[PDB]
């Protein structure tokens, strides 16, 4: 009878429990201690000013109402029981479409320790907003965020606090960089307070710092443009009588630069201001003219 | 009769069954054996750094609670009973969007054996993330894996293995990709070590070797022949100024057109590749 006690504990655990009331309603401020392991920093979609991040999101609070005693010290809960307990309703302020994976079973886990400590692990992909300023395209560097916090619980009800020192509470896996275009440089985690029309909320931010690679635009736009300008200038070395020859240089080099500029600005998203590559293209076209 | 007899058999098995408890909760770990019948590998997208595969993913374990003697025949139960049993919390470590097909009913299998063995099958389309390195593109081999782990149970509670251990994965040799060709597949079982324990893991790794004849015919042949055509201007006599200018400058134009149309046809990979190096070489020669 080594499971009779286990099942008695599991059934008695949720007697007199109210999943509508946060732990310590009138007595404390619920302190959810967050922690994020970024398994892979997914692709940064330049067109949409978004970026995907696949994370293990661990939140640990204290529920005095689940203090049990028995032969076990740590007690696991299935998802059916995890839906019957109060859990922080964290969301991502800048998230667009986050997906929590449920294959083959919900990628969630909830543990309870004797003293009433709850640990909630989730695996989820967050497709968040990465507002970009491409004035230095393709030589731009971005610092775009992952801000998350609580919905419906102001700063006086639920206060998030990173588990260890802010910068050791968000970690990116070694092979987690799934970016083929940028170079994840570093990360700055911080905590702040946001004031809205509904109250004051705790917000846990994590800026990921990205630097764009240049080696592709170099050999794909810059060198073709430079060679086209050099070729246009080389027309001066031909003798003057060869009017058809020099005219053909002029016009066909204009056509090549037209094609190159069209292709480069096809590669760039459809921003409404001049980038560094755009200035280079403009000056090159002026040179050929 | 027989029909009722089995009705009471299954009802008795399920009455007083605690889904929250794994097989042999207080005892040795439960061993789960896995098969995969790869139905298809659909799309290997270099832009999204992912591939898609449809499989018949099967697991088999022992659940002494689900043991019966009063019938000999292998029981096969309606999939809706898989909700009332314990099934391992396996998850695919590198997937992005996965789903079990649900037409005409939820595509899964639950099959009990008289000795307690439980077989549990799903029909899954998983979009796995395949890290890629296309420096050598299009002359590159891409090792695309699928990693299977257990979320909550450690090796002290659950153990993973391939059922058969070398034939566990079938249907792979019959996969006909449009752009690649499976040259080998490996099965690797292991126990990975993390902070709070060691978790089991299996790994199905394909090596995809990209077919080259297309890329030859479409990208290299035009560029090589345009380089030769540019050379043609040398046999044209020095006086033929308009002729040699036409030839050379039009060859530059054609090389630019080829480059800027392959830039679109080819997957948008914003780092430098071997194909780009070759096109740059031909351009520099013109």
């Amino acid at each position, epitope marked *: 009878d080594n499971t009779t006690v286990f099942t008695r504990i599991l059934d008695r655990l949720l007697d007199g429990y109210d999943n509508r009331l946060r732990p310590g309603l009138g007595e404390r401020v619920t302190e959810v201690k967050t*922690d994020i*392991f970024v*398994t892979s920093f997914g692709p940064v979609s330049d067109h949409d000013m978004e970026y995907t991040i696949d994370v*293990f999101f*661990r939140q*640990s609070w204290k529920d005095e109402r689940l203090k049990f005693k028995g032969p*076990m*010290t*740590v007690l696991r809960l299935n998802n059916l029981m995890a839906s019957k307990i109060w859990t922080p309703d964290t969301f991502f302020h800048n998230g667009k479409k986050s997906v929590a994976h449920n294959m083959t079973m919900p990628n969630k886990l909830l543990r309870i*320790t*004797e*003293d009433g*400590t709850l640990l909630y*692990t989730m695996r989820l992909t967050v497709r968040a907003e990465c507002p970009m300023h491409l004035e230095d395209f393709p030589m731009d560097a971005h610092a775009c965020p992952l801000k998350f916090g609580s919905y419906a619980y102001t700063r006086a009800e639920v206060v998030y*606090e990173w*588990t*260890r*020192e*802010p*910068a*050791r509470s968000v*970690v990116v*896996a070694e092979d987690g960089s799934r970016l083929n275009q940028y170079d994840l440089l570093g990360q700055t985690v911080d905590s702040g307070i946001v004031q809205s029309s509904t109250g004051e909320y705790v917000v846990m931010t994590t800026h990921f710092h990205l630097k764009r690679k240049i080696g592709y635009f170099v050999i794909q736009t810059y060198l073709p443009c430079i060679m086209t300008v050099i070729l246009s200038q080389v027309s001066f070395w031909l003798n003057r009588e060869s009017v058809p020859a020099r005219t053909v240089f002029g016009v066909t080099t204009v056509l090549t630069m037209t094609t190159l500029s069209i292709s480069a600005r096809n590669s760039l998203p459809k921003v409404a201001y001049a980038t560094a590559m755009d200035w280079f293209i403009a000056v090159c076209y002026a040179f050929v003219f | 009769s027989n029909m009722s007899l089995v009705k009471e058999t299954v009802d008795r098995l399920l009455k007083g069954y605690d889904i929250r408890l794994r097989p042999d909760f207080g005892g040795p770990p439960v061993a789960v054996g896995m098969n995969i019948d790869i139905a298809s590998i659909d799309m290997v997208s270099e832009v999204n750094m992912d591939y898609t595969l449809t499989m018949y993913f099967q697991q088999a374990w022992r659940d002494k609670r689900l043991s019966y003697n009063v019938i000999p025949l292998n029981l096969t139960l309606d999939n809706r009973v898989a909700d009332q049993l314990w099934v391992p919390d396996t998850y695919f470590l590198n997937d992005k969007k996965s789903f079990v097909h649900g037409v005409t009913v939820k595509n899964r299998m639950i099959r009990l054996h008289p000795d307690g063995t439980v077989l549990y099958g799903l029909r899954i389309t998983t979009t796995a993330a395949c890290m890629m390195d296309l420096r050598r593109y299009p002359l590159d081999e891409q090792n695309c894996t699928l990693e299977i782990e257990s979320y909550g149970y450690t090796t002290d509670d659950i153990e993973f293995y391939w059922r058969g251990d070398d034939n566990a994965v079938t249907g792979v040799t019959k996969i006909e990709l449009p752009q690649f060709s499976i040259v080998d597949y490996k099965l690797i079982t292991k126990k990975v*070590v*993390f*902070s*709070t*324990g*060691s*978790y089991p893991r299996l790994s199905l790794s394909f090596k995809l070797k990209r077919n080259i004849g297309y890329f030859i015919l479409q990208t290299y042949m035009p560029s090589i022949l345009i380089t030769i055509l540019s050379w043609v201007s040398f046999w044209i006599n020095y006086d033929a100024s308009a002729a040699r200018v036409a030839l050379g400058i039009t060859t530059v134009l054609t090389m630019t057109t080829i480059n800027t149309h392959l830039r679109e046809t080819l997957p948008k990979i914003p780092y430098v590749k071997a194909i780009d190096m070759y096109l740059m070489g031909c351009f520099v020669f013109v």
Partner: antibody
Amino acid sequence: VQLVQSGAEVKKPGASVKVSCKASGYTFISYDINWVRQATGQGLEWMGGMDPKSGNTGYAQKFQGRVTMTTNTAISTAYMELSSLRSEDTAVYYCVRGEQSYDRTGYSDWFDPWGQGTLVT
Amino acid sequence: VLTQPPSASGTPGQRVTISCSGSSSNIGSNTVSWYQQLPGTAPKLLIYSTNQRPSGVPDRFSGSKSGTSASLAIGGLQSEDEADYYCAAWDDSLKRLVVFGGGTRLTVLG
């Protein structure tokens, strides 16, 4: 990786004491520096930690208002300053590096380099 | 706060086991690590994460954790293992707290 530490010190009760811990062989800012005391007659005790990157500190409960663990990134030293000395403060003060691993399933901490170094009152 | 035997003993060859017992907020939640201390010198790391072994410590040593208790099993006990053995486990009752055990003086009979 080593945590070469200051020489012995002798002082009379009530006089602030200084101990220093120069680290070499590892990026001094990546890992943390925990100070562990050890009285000759009894077992180990944890004085407190400090992150060499943020300066964040965690002095133990029994030394909440008696310690000052600062750190000098330039020369990669972390020197503790115990104050309000007493007769029970005589012990070998060790400098340890709190190596740490974090991954999917939580954290796990330990102290691999360790050091030496003493003080008597 | 962690409590372990004041001292243990074992004849050479015999497998002796030192144990630590603590509340659920340090060992029940975190991983222990064991620290040998040869007589008079500075303690060294012997086991971390309760199972892993630092490069240098022979496979002879092995640790385990069961619920709220930990055990260091010194198989094939030899003479040079005569030392103190402590166990540490970071506590979750405050953001930075690590609690050492009392320590165990292990002696080699003979």
